[PDB]
Amino acid sequence: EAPNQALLRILKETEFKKIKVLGSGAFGTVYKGLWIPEGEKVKIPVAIKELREATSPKANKEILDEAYVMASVDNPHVCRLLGICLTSTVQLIMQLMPFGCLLDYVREHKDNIGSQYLLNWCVQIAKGMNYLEDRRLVHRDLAARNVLVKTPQHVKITDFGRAVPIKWMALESILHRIYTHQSDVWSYGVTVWELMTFGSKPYDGIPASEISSILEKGERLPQPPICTIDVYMIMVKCWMIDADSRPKFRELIIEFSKMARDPQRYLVIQGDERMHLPSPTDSNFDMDDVVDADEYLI
Numbered sequence: 682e683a684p685n686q687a688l689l690r691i692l693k694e695t696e697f698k699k700i701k702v703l704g705s706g707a708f709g710t711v712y713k714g715l716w717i718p719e720g721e722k723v724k725i726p727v728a729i730k731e732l733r734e735a736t737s738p739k740a741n742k743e744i745l746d747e748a749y750v751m752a753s754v755d756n757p758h759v760c761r762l763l764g765i766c767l768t769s770t771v772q773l774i775m776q777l778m779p780f781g782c783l784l785d786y787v788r789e790h791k792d793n794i795g796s797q798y799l800l801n802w803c804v805q806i807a808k809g810m811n812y813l814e815d816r817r818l819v820h821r822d823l824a825a826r827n828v829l830v831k832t833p834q835h836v837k838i839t840d841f842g843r844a845v846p847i848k849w850m851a852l853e854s855i856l857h858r859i860y861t862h863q864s865d866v867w868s869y870g871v872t873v874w875e876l877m878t879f880g881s882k883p884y885d886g887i888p889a890s891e892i893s894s895i896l897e898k899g900e901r902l903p904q905p906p907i908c909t910i911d912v913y914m915i916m917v918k919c920w921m922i923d924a925d926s927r928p929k930f931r932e933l934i935i936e937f938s939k940m941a942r943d944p945q946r947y948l949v950i951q952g953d954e955r956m957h958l959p960s961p962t963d964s965n966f967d968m969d970d971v972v973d974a975d976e977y978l979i
């Protein structure tokens with residue numbers, strides 16, 4: 682097939698500064714930083730990832746496989762790699778998404794998330810997913826935790842650089858380890874459910890081993906209180922046994938876009954209209970010569 686002509690950018694350690702830790706886990710440590718190129722008179726807000734501390738040959742392999750996938754994509758609703766740093770332990774550089782992941786965002790800002798935002802996010806996620814489809818790239822781990830927030834009005838898919846989350850998996854994935862663009866549609870349905878419930882845990886309390894039987898019986902995730910039969914029907918469609926019967930991401934873009942034009946007709950949120958999230962007003966944004974990675978291209 683088509684040669685992958687993507688450019689792998691190597692960044693000098695002296696060109697970027699680590700400000701603070703955003704998160705620390707099994708993957709290692711993620712830092713909030715600033716990338717100051719050569720003498721370009723620009724300061725790019727970045728996120729720097731590093732393999733904890735130790736350097737084992739197999740760990741570097743796994744982080745370079747992520748760099749490969751991340752550098753191979755370019756879409757407004759998909760997270761991209763800015764570059765790699767070849768220190769003792771390899772470092773991944775990517776654009777800073779100041780509001781963190783969507784799952785934490787909806788849990789922490791539920792009292793100000795209106796129907797417009799929820800529906801716009803659904804369009805945005807489907808658009809990224811449709812790009813991943815056009816590029817023949819299957820996510821395998823789509824969930825609200827794997828959707829980063831640039832601005833509350835702009836979200837981007839991440840962690841597709843995996844190519845077990847049973848409660849987000851399609852039936853063919855659990856039983857036969859089948860991962861397709863249609864199995865990502867099921868995971869998308871669970872992601873929408875996560876947003877609509879304002880970050881609730883799917884099948885909370887129920888063990889992972891029982892999920893297979895629950896799904897095979899015909900039981901699915903409940904109708905979120907704010908969901909009209911219109912939105913919920915779409916979620917239900919994503920959770921069908923027949924993968925070809927499930928909607929396509931281009932169908933999901935259209936359907937959610939139709940709904941986003943009259944958001945109060947499709948999502949009933951009490952207190953909606955009087956709700957507002959941080960937007961480019963007063964204090965949305967050193968801080969001199971700062972430019973976003975989306976506007977900086979060499």
Ligand SMILES: CC1(C)OCc2c(Nc3n[nH]c4c(Cl)cccc34)nc(-c3cn[nH]c3)nc21
Nearest residue numbers: 703704711728729730773774775776777778782
């Ligand atoms: C702390 C939290 C929310 O958890 C983990 C993680 C993460 N993981 C990454 N995955 N891939 C990355 C690359 Cl290539 C570079 C830098 C970070 C990552 N990335 C971010 C992030 C923030 N702004 N932009 C990316 N945030 C998080």
